[PDB]
Amino acid sequence: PRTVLPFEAMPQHPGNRWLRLLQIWREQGYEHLHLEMHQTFQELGPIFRYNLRMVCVMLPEDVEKLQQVDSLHPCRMILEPWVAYRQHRGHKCGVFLLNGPEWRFNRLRLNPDVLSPKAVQRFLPMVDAVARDFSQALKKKVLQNARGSLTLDVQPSIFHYTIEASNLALFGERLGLVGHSPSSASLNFLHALEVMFKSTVQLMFMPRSLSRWISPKVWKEHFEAWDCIFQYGDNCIQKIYQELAFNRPQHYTGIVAELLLKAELSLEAIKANSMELTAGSVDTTAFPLLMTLFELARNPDVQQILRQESLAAAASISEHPQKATTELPLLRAALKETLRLYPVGLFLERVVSSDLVLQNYHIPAGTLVQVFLYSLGRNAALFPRPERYNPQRWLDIRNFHHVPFGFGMRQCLGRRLAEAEMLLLLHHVLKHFLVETLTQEDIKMVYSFILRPGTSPLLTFRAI
Ligand code: HEM
Ligand SMILES: N#Cc1ccc([C@H]2CCc3cncn32)c(F)c1
């Protein structure tokens, strides 16, 4: 009356666990993971076993079932390389690394000031200032050239834009990074994140009983990077903590400001989540920005459509920047499209707390279930012509097809801060510049814990 199949009758990935661990040892990474999975899905179907009890799915069909099984305490897998550092230095873990009742406790005291629509209305104007400074700075340099255009690799400037906006919205501090040269503090922070991501892949696929002695140099490499990260994050904390102890302001001065004033969370559990918000707000946000710019340069037909929208609502957004979330549907659709093809978050994890059925297969509890978004977003059955950058496919309205930020109570905490940074930067670049490129070959994607472009194209910014 439904049909359920044995778990042991699942299509099995041909690989051998141990050899892939030795391949990662040798290659110092797993850059082509998204491709090896996409291929396997094409050979075995929309579900298969992979003892790297792990099950890999790809259909919105399955995400919905996975949220139905989400308990009151959804459970992702512990990320030991990250947790190890937290306890080596006697730190508390944030929402990204917690599970069970402690996670629910932190999460419910963070949602109001980090994710709610009322909080977005307060920090969104602050993001807008940074986005306007980004284009104002870019326009000054552009109109200095004879052809009123600047051609460059924008990945540095964009990454320093996301550090600016994130620090302003989190701590209410303004660091001279947009319109000015990078500081050694930021360049060291970005390099630590790069190494923290690299070394994570080298250690996350083998238990600590092996990586301890086969790759101890990497563990050192890994903890050093975190130290540099906790250094940058904690200097942001120590500044705002001392600044608030002497005056409790009456206006909005950032997110972490409210979290400290409320004091619903212990000091160590604010520092913990304040680390995860400072650290996970740079790469994950900046790379979809770059790909959005890239895809618009490849499709000027789509670009001008977005520029028209953004030029019309330009006035009502300068009056109240909050309107950007509702006056720029096409640009919000473009962002949905970028993440469909270039999902910085490759997969969603759930250790199911209860039996379930996927693709008419029995899934026991305690099983790890990974949703592989790279193939989910490329399944022609659900996305007609998935090879095409078509923002208008999201405007019609199809509910679990857009899950780059996860689902359930666990869904991304910074979801709306990221959307505002991406949206507001693209809105002010579209109404002042044209983004053009000769580079029209697809950009190869790399897996270093996140899915990111292995190359950054040359982009021209021509002014209007
Ligand atoms: C395009 C940008 C981003 C994408 C695609 C993304 C993706 C994701 C995904 C897939 C998850 C897992 C959720 C789940 O498994 O249910 C997640 C969780 C999380 N993200 Fe984001 N993220 C982005 C930006 C950010 C930003 C900017 C921040 C902080 C400022 C952030 C902080 C977090 C945290 C703390 C969690 C853990 C939430 C929890 O476990 O309850 N992310 N994100
Ligand atoms: N501490 C810390 C921390 C937490 C999260 C991220 C990124 C990686 C994947 C993801 C999804 N949302 C944000 N992130 C990070 F880089 C550092």
XYZ file of C-alpha atoms and ligand atoms in Angstrom:
524
model
C 0.000 0.000 0.000
C 3.161 2.148 -0.380
C 5.952 -0.468 -0.741
C 9.067 -0.485 1.471
C 12.320 -2.146 0.465
C 15.146 -3.524 2.614
C 17.913 -1.113 3.496
C 20.446 -3.675 2.301
C 18.927 -3.530 -1.213
C 20.258 0.008 -1.747
C 22.498 0.906 -4.702
C 26.012 0.960 -3.274
C 28.811 3.352 -4.179
C 31.606 1.266 -5.778
C 34.423 3.039 -3.930
C 36.385 1.626 -1.012
C 36.360 3.731 2.155
C 39.997 3.162 3.077
C 41.409 4.015 -0.351
C 39.560 7.343 -0.499
C 41.018 8.182 2.916
C 44.472 7.458 1.502
C 43.611 9.448 -1.619
C 42.768 12.430 0.578
C 46.012 11.912 2.499
C 47.913 12.032 -0.799
C 45.967 14.793 -2.565
C 45.594 16.837 0.660
C 41.924 17.304 -0.147
C 38.894 16.149 -2.088
C 38.374 19.013 -4.537
C 36.382 16.963 -7.069
C 33.886 15.550 -4.544
C 30.826 17.301 -5.966
C 31.631 15.763 -9.356
C 32.257 12.222 -8.094
C 28.869 12.345 -6.360
C 27.024 13.903 -9.297
C 28.405 11.089 -11.447
C 27.438 8.363 -8.978
C 23.888 9.719 -8.796
C 23.757 9.519 -12.594
C 24.805 5.845 -12.429
C 22.803 4.591 -9.423
C 19.696 6.769 -9.057
C 18.451 9.371 -6.573
C 19.663 7.379 -3.556
C 22.685 5.232 -2.693
C 24.778 3.964 0.217
C 28.225 5.402 0.872
C 30.233 4.164 3.885
C 32.844 6.926 3.658
C 25.314 4.080 7.754
C 25.395 6.936 5.235
C 22.770 7.578 2.543
C 23.027 10.212 -0.197
C 19.804 11.645 -1.645
C 19.075 14.487 -4.077
C 15.308 15.118 -4.409
C 13.079 17.662 -2.637
C 10.878 14.588 -2.197
C 13.412 13.522 0.441
C 14.110 16.835 2.187
C 10.422 17.091 3.100
C 10.548 13.618 4.638
C 13.724 14.576 6.504
C 12.076 17.624 8.082
C 9.092 15.457 9.029
C 11.550 13.326 11.022
C 13.279 16.347 12.591
C 12.792 15.847 16.318
C 12.636 18.707 18.799
C 16.464 18.466 18.613
C 17.563 17.971 14.992
C 21.004 16.395 14.842
C 23.853 17.004 12.430
C 27.080 15.070 12.704
C 29.679 16.320 15.125
C 32.496 18.009 13.210
C 35.367 16.721 15.327
C 38.197 18.896 13.899
C 36.173 21.956 14.927
C 34.953 20.606 18.271
C 38.466 19.438 19.136
C 39.753 23.008 19.070
C 36.833 24.305 21.127
C 37.662 21.928 23.985
C 41.449 22.042 23.584
C 41.159 25.725 24.569
C 38.225 25.176 26.943
C 35.664 27.063 24.867
C 31.942 26.532 24.503
C 30.534 25.502 21.128
C 28.096 27.632 19.159
C 24.855 26.690 17.451
C 26.712 25.411 14.381
C 28.531 22.742 16.434
C 26.003 21.875 19.158
C 23.313 19.191 19.347
C 20.394 18.171 21.509
C 19.009 20.313 24.331
C 21.950 22.723 24.550
C 21.557 23.580 20.869
C 17.858 24.348 21.285
C 18.721 26.611 24.226
C 21.236 28.708 22.274
C 19.122 28.738 19.114
C 15.980 30.195 20.679
C 17.963 33.056 22.259
C 19.654 33.914 18.937
C 16.751 33.831 16.473
C 15.149 37.119 17.654
C 18.261 39.295 17.214
C 19.919 37.496 14.276
C 17.157 36.189 12.018
C 13.753 37.711 12.831
C 12.201 40.242 10.430
C 12.272 42.838 13.218
C 16.044 42.517 13.591
C 16.577 42.649 9.825
C 14.828 46.021 9.775
C 17.435 47.375 12.207
C 20.704 46.099 10.713
C 19.651 46.231 7.050
C 20.147 50.034 6.766
C 23.652 49.524 8.157
C 24.467 47.023 5.403
C 23.137 49.514 2.845
C 25.680 52.162 3.858
C 28.496 49.703 3.177
C 27.024 48.694 -0.178
C 26.722 52.358 -1.177
C 30.326 52.966 -0.114
C 31.388 49.974 -2.213
C 29.854 51.389 -5.402
C 30.781 54.994 -4.587
C 34.384 53.866 -4.134
C 34.234 51.810 -7.336
C 32.682 54.667 -9.316
C 35.464 57.063 -8.281
C 38.157 54.710 -9.578
C 36.178 53.959 -12.745
C 35.621 57.551 -13.878
C 39.388 58.146 -13.587
C 40.053 55.967 -16.654
C 39.648 57.160 -20.230
C 36.992 54.566 -21.111
C 35.139 55.160 -17.841
C 35.476 51.524 -16.828
C 37.611 49.376 -14.528
C 38.538 45.768 -15.306
C 39.753 43.669 -12.399
C 39.431 40.588 -10.217
C 36.776 41.620 -7.695
C 37.183 38.675 -5.315
C 39.426 40.680 -2.932
C 37.158 43.738 -2.859
C 34.047 41.570 -2.467
C 35.564 39.521 0.360
C 36.506 42.746 2.149
C 32.992 44.041 1.508
C 31.513 41.073 3.375
C 33.939 41.546 6.273
C 32.861 45.193 6.485
C 29.109 44.611 6.366
C 29.311 41.625 8.714
C 31.325 43.508 11.333
C 29.022 46.532 11.101
C 25.848 44.469 11.472
C 27.265 42.225 14.211
C 29.257 44.689 16.338
C 28.326 48.106 14.969
C 31.994 48.864 14.310
C 33.220 50.266 10.999
C 36.612 49.037 9.768
C 38.232 51.001 6.957
C 38.149 48.167 4.415
C 35.729 49.285 1.668
C 37.283 51.945 -0.534
C 40.704 51.442 1.086
C 43.521 48.928 0.976
C 43.265 45.695 2.998
C 44.777 45.638 6.471
C 47.132 42.912 7.636
C 44.523 41.993 10.258
C 41.956 41.185 7.564
C 44.411 39.465 5.212
C 45.540 37.241 8.097
C 41.910 36.536 8.998
C 41.062 35.548 5.420
C 44.138 33.336 5.132
C 43.305 31.576 8.390
C 39.813 30.835 7.069
C 41.304 29.489 3.835
C 43.578 27.143 5.797
C 40.848 26.287 8.305
C 38.682 25.077 5.411
C 41.506 23.179 3.685
C 42.719 21.394 6.822
C 39.115 20.532 7.736
C 38.721 18.286 4.677
C 42.058 16.622 5.437
C 40.850 15.623 8.919
C 37.052 15.216 8.753
C 37.009 11.929 6.789
C 39.074 9.741 9.148
C 38.654 9.257 12.913
C 41.034 11.000 15.276
C 42.586 7.626 16.155
C 44.228 7.603 12.696
C 44.672 11.274 11.749
C 46.457 11.664 15.104
C 49.619 9.942 13.852
C 49.234 9.755 10.064
C 48.589 13.525 9.709
C 49.658 15.287 12.921
C 51.164 18.184 10.988
C 47.670 18.971 9.683
C 46.185 19.044 13.189
C 48.799 21.643 14.118
C 48.091 23.529 10.882
C 44.393 23.366 11.780
C 44.596 24.610 15.379
C 46.948 27.430 14.371
C 44.364 28.681 11.874
C 41.619 28.633 14.501
C 43.868 30.527 16.929
C 44.222 33.259 14.313
C 40.440 33.176 13.856
C 39.551 33.230 17.554
C 42.066 36.066 17.841
C 40.254 38.224 15.292
C 36.836 37.327 16.657
C 37.736 37.852 20.304
C 39.182 41.305 19.672
C 35.757 42.243 18.295
C 34.156 40.828 21.454
C 36.461 42.514 23.968
C 35.854 45.907 22.340
C 32.047 45.801 22.407
C 31.883 44.226 25.876
C 33.912 47.050 27.423
C 32.050 49.673 25.394
C 28.660 48.465 26.661
C 29.685 48.069 30.311
C 30.144 51.864 30.461
C 27.067 52.919 28.456
C 23.964 50.977 27.416
C 22.976 52.738 24.179
C 19.397 53.561 23.261
C 19.718 53.126 19.482
C 20.614 50.056 17.446
C 24.351 49.334 17.471
C 24.493 45.796 16.068
C 23.369 42.258 16.741
C 25.901 41.211 19.389
C 24.976 44.461 21.130
C 21.428 43.191 21.707
C 22.620 39.719 22.723
C 24.789 41.212 25.476
C 22.156 43.707 26.656
C 19.513 40.967 26.875
C 21.944 38.651 28.697
C 19.680 35.642 28.187
C 22.858 33.710 27.306
C 25.943 33.345 29.482
C 28.969 35.391 28.481
C 30.805 32.304 27.226
C 27.792 31.227 25.139
C 27.646 34.681 23.561
C 31.363 34.651 22.779
C 30.877 31.172 21.312
C 28.093 32.122 18.904
C 29.759 35.479 18.286
C 32.782 33.541 17.018
C 30.691 31.405 14.671
C 28.925 34.479 13.273
C 32.173 36.386 12.721
C 33.847 33.350 11.132
C 31.058 31.953 8.946
C 29.909 35.258 7.460
C 32.738 35.859 4.967
C 33.326 33.027 2.490
C 29.793 31.605 2.459
C 28.353 35.012 1.529
C 31.065 36.358 -0.773
C 31.246 33.460 -3.226
C 27.575 33.586 -4.302
C 28.143 37.319 -4.804
C 31.029 36.627 -7.196
C 29.091 33.960 -9.098
C 26.042 36.226 -9.338
C 28.247 38.935 -10.849
C 29.818 36.334 -13.140
C 26.496 34.908 -14.319
C 25.139 38.410 -14.972
C 28.178 39.239 -17.107
C 27.515 36.057 -19.091
C 23.811 36.924 -19.527
C 23.520 40.674 -20.161
C 19.929 40.009 -21.241
C 19.143 38.965 -17.660
C 21.351 41.742 -16.281
C 19.484 44.629 -17.922
C 16.208 43.151 -16.669
C 17.657 43.341 -13.150
C 19.030 46.846 -13.708
C 15.614 48.118 -14.821
C 13.987 46.727 -11.680
C 16.742 48.199 -9.508
C 16.599 51.603 -11.226
C 12.820 51.843 -10.803
C 12.756 51.054 -7.073
C 15.997 53.045 -6.560
C 14.185 56.039 -5.067
C 11.900 54.147 -2.687
C 14.921 52.156 -1.479
C 16.976 55.286 -0.768
C 14.031 56.462 1.344
C 13.842 53.169 3.276
C 16.399 50.444 2.463
C 14.174 47.861 4.163
C 12.045 47.877 1.004
C 14.835 46.119 -0.913
C 13.600 42.754 0.376
C 10.197 43.371 -1.267
C 10.844 45.722 -4.222
C 13.569 43.612 -5.906
C 11.972 40.202 -6.520
C 13.953 39.589 -9.706
C 17.243 40.141 -7.875
C 16.116 37.834 -5.069
C 15.323 35.301 -7.794
C 18.790 35.747 -9.299
C 20.276 34.912 -5.894
C 18.085 31.806 -5.668
C 19.481 30.837 -9.078
C 23.157 31.365 -8.202
C 22.836 29.163 -5.108
C 21.064 26.508 -7.178
C 24.065 26.119 -9.481
C 26.826 27.213 -7.068
C 25.671 26.058 -3.617
C 28.459 27.108 -1.224
C 26.799 24.706 1.172
C 27.250 21.477 -0.763
C 25.066 19.187 1.337
C 22.689 19.106 4.291
C 23.293 16.608 7.097
C 20.829 14.824 9.353
C 21.397 11.898 11.693
C 17.802 10.682 11.617
C 16.466 10.131 15.137
C 13.748 7.758 13.869
C 13.131 5.233 11.096
C 11.865 6.596 7.776
C 11.406 5.662 4.119
C 13.310 7.304 1.251
C 12.902 6.286 -2.398
C 10.839 3.362 -1.110
C 13.766 2.165 1.001
C 13.865 1.540 4.742
C 16.219 3.936 6.546
C 17.061 2.911 10.142
C 17.493 5.464 12.895
C 20.964 6.741 13.682
C 21.617 6.758 9.935
C 23.420 9.709 8.385
C 21.420 11.186 5.492
C 23.127 13.689 3.173
C 21.224 15.799 0.646
C 23.557 16.628 -2.245
C 22.400 20.040 -3.464
C 24.704 20.206 -6.493
C 22.694 17.437 -8.176
C 19.357 18.459 -6.639
C 19.637 21.799 -8.432
C 20.670 20.156 -11.714
C 17.858 17.562 -11.960
C 16.158 18.500 -15.231
C 13.008 16.694 -14.074
C 12.493 19.379 -11.399
C 14.291 22.298 -13.110
C 13.571 22.502 -16.860
C 16.800 23.392 -18.654
C 18.934 23.370 -15.477
C 21.998 24.342 -17.531
C 20.502 27.842 -17.935
C 20.753 30.841 -15.603
C 17.036 31.691 -15.563
C 16.010 33.842 -12.574
C 12.370 34.084 -13.691
C 11.836 30.397 -12.856
C 11.448 31.345 -9.173
C 8.924 34.149 -9.680
C 5.955 31.908 -10.413
C 6.288 30.576 -6.831
C 7.527 24.010 -5.447
C 8.432 24.458 -1.769
C 11.453 22.248 -1.016
C 13.216 23.115 -4.297
C 15.066 26.049 -2.679
C 17.007 24.718 0.308
C 20.547 26.171 0.060
C 20.191 27.372 3.679
C 18.824 24.129 5.114
C 15.430 23.516 6.651
C 13.555 23.200 9.907
C 14.604 24.883 13.129
C 18.233 24.189 12.173
C 17.978 26.348 9.018
C 20.792 28.874 8.601
C 20.942 31.447 11.378
C 22.581 34.152 9.260
C 20.275 33.434 6.312
C 18.779 36.919 6.226
C 22.020 38.789 6.925
C 23.579 37.001 3.953
C 20.606 37.782 1.701
C 20.772 41.463 2.634
C 24.515 41.755 2.002
C 24.250 40.016 -1.376
C 21.074 41.834 -2.426
C 22.147 45.328 -1.377
C 25.569 45.094 -3.034
C 24.101 43.929 -6.348
C 21.387 46.595 -6.224
C 23.869 49.484 -6.072
C 26.246 48.008 -8.650
C 23.442 47.406 -11.167
C 22.174 51.001 -10.989
C 25.641 52.470 -11.649
C 27.641 49.969 -13.738
C 27.556 47.391 -16.501
C 29.296 44.093 -15.734
C 30.934 42.610 -18.826
C 33.385 39.806 -19.543
C 34.952 37.839 -22.368
C 35.439 34.860 -20.033
C 32.355 32.820 -20.946
C 33.606 29.302 -20.186
C 32.044 27.726 -17.111
C 34.049 28.218 -13.920
C 35.242 24.966 -12.384
C 34.097 24.498 -8.789
C 36.291 23.246 -5.945
C 35.337 21.513 -2.695
C 37.263 22.796 0.333
C 34.439 22.165 2.848
C 32.422 24.723 0.892
C 31.755 24.708 -2.849
C 33.705 27.662 -4.233
C 35.005 28.736 -7.655
C 38.517 27.545 -8.436
C 39.103 30.646 -10.549
C 37.956 34.263 -10.454
C 37.072 35.825 -13.827
C 38.114 39.198 -15.168
C 35.121 41.529 -14.811
C 34.701 44.940 -16.439
C 32.671 47.624 -14.651
C 31.515 50.303 -17.116
C 29.706 53.319 -15.677
C 26.440 54.897 -16.811
C 24.655 32.160 0.994
C 25.053 32.190 2.267
C 24.917 30.973 3.211
C 24.545 29.718 2.931
C 24.154 29.124 1.563
C 24.567 28.961 4.164
C 24.257 27.631 4.292
C 23.991 27.003 5.481
C 23.533 25.641 5.632
C 23.269 24.651 4.482
C 23.384 25.395 6.931
C 22.905 24.066 7.554
C 21.479 24.234 8.074
C 20.868 22.882 8.337
O 21.590 21.856 8.225
O 19.654 22.836 8.657
C 23.738 26.600 7.649
C 23.717 26.758 9.011
C 24.272 27.816 9.691
N 24.718 28.993 9.123
Fe 24.627 29.511 7.159
N 24.957 29.798 5.192
C 25.179 31.042 4.635
C 25.586 32.162 5.319
C 25.724 32.244 6.682
C 26.063 33.442 7.415
C 26.322 34.801 6.735
C 26.114 33.128 8.718
C 26.417 34.024 9.945
C 26.462 35.357 9.860
C 25.794 31.723 8.837
C 25.733 31.024 10.016
C 25.197 29.772 10.154
C 25.039 29.057 11.397
C 25.451 29.583 12.786
C 24.480 27.878 11.122
C 24.115 26.761 12.128
C 22.614 26.785 12.428
C 22.208 25.585 13.256
O 22.949 24.571 13.267
O 21.143 25.640 13.921
N 25.562 31.207 7.577
N 24.108 27.570 6.736
N 33.116 28.971 13.901
C 32.635 28.863 12.818
C 32.085 28.742 11.533
C 30.750 28.375 11.273
C 30.276 28.275 9.948
C 31.090 28.531 8.834
C 30.534 28.406 7.443
C 30.952 27.064 6.798
C 29.653 26.343 6.329
C 28.562 27.280 6.662
C 27.194 27.483 6.611
N 26.881 28.711 7.184
C 28.023 29.263 7.584
N 29.091 28.431 7.293
C 32.390 28.886 9.131
F 33.205 29.141 8.065
C 32.905 28.998 10.426
